[PDB]
Amino acid sequence: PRVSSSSMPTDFPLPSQQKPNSAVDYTLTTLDAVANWARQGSFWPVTFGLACCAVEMMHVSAPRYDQDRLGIIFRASPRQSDIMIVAGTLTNKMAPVLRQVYDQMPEPRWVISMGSCANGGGYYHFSYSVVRGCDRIVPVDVYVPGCPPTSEALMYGVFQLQRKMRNTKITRMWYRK
Amino acid sequence: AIIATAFAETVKFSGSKQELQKRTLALYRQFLRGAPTFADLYEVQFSIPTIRTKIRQEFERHRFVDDLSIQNVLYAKGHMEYQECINFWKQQAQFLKYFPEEDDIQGRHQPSNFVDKFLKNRA
C-alpha cells in the first residue's frame, strides 16, 4: 500500500520562534547548549588576517583586556582553528592567500571583520590595489566598525558572535529536518 | 651585495634589431620549454599545447612593432613575466588571467551585430 496522502501540518513555527515542549526537545536543547558552551568557551582564531591594525588586536591580548580569560587563543595554523579575523587592508595580491586559509579551516567556521578597511575598504576604497570589502572573497558573520576599532569594540563583537553561536541549532534542526 | 634572483637578466638596451631578434627568440624558447612547469606549478585544467598556443598569440600581438626602444621594453617586460611564472610567485588567478577562453561560455547573447548592441544599449 504505497503512500498517497499527507498529514503535513501547517502553522509549524519557524526555528527562531520554536519553543520546546517535549522531552526530546529539552534533550536536544541540552545537547545543543553544551556544544555551544564548548564553542563559546574555546574561541581560537588563526594568526592570519592580522596584517594592518594588528596593534589594537594585540591590545586585546594584553593585560587590561585579556582575551585568554574568555578562552581565546591565537593559533599559527588554520587546521586547529575555527575563527578568522580579517583585520587590515585586504589587497588584491593577498585575497587568494586568504581564501586558501579559509578553505583550509575545518567546519564549523566563522568570520569576523575587524575594521573599516576590511568591511568596505574604508579609506582606500577607491584605490587600485584593494578589495572593496572582504565580503567579496569570504562570508562574514560579524562586522566590527572602526579604524582602528577599540579593544572594547572587538570584545563586544566577540560577545555578539558568542551570542550567534549560542542561539544556534545543531541537533534541533536535525530533529526538524 | 644584493645579488640577483634566479632567472634574472640584467636590463640591457640593445642598439640593433638584429640582436633583439635573438634575445626574443631565446625568450620564446624558454617559455615553451617551461610550459609544462607552468602546468604543474599552477593547477591547470587544460593542455600544454593550449599554453603554447597562447604564448604564440602573445608574441604575435607585437610582431609588427618596428620602433626599437618599444621592442626593448616589450622584451624586458616579457622576461619579467617569465621570471614571475617560473619561480612560483604568481598564484593561479594571476596566471589564468591569460586564459579567459578556457573558462566556460559566459552566457548566451554575446552581441556581434548592431541590432543586438542597440537592444542592450552597447552601440
Binding site: - | 631578434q21 635573438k22 627568440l25 620564446y28 624558447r29 615553451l32 620549454r33 603554447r52 604564440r56 608574441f59
Partner: protein
C-alpha cells in the same frame, strides 16, 4: 640515423602549420620551404628536444635550421639517440 629521422619527421608533420602534409625530406629547409616562420623554427626544435628527452643550448638551437642539422645534433648522443 634511421633511429632519429623516424621521430623527427614524425614531429614535423605533427606540426600543423606546414602547408604541405607530405613534403618532409632531408634537405628540406625549415625556412625557404616556407613550412615555418622564425617562431615555428623554435617551436619545432623545442618539440624535438623534448621528444628525445634533451635540452639543446642557445647557440646551437639557433644553428639547427634544417632536418640535416637536427639529425646530426641528436647524433652526439646526449640521450635517446
Amino acid at each position: 640515423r634511421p633511429d632519429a629521422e623516424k621521430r623527427i619527421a614524425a614531429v614535423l608533420e605533427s606540426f600543423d602549420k606546414i602547408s604541405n602534409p607530405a613534403a618532409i625530406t632531408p634537405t628540406a629547409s625549415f625556412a625557404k620551404d616556407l613550412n615555418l616562420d622564425s617562431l615555428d623554427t623554435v617551436e619545432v626544435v623545442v618539440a624535438i628536444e623534448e621528444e628525445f628527452g634533451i635540452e639543446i643550448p642557445d647557440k646551437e638551437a639557433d644553428e639547427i635550421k634544417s632536418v640535416n642539422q637536427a639529425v646530426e645534433y641528436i647524433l652526439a648522443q646526449p640521450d635517446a639517440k
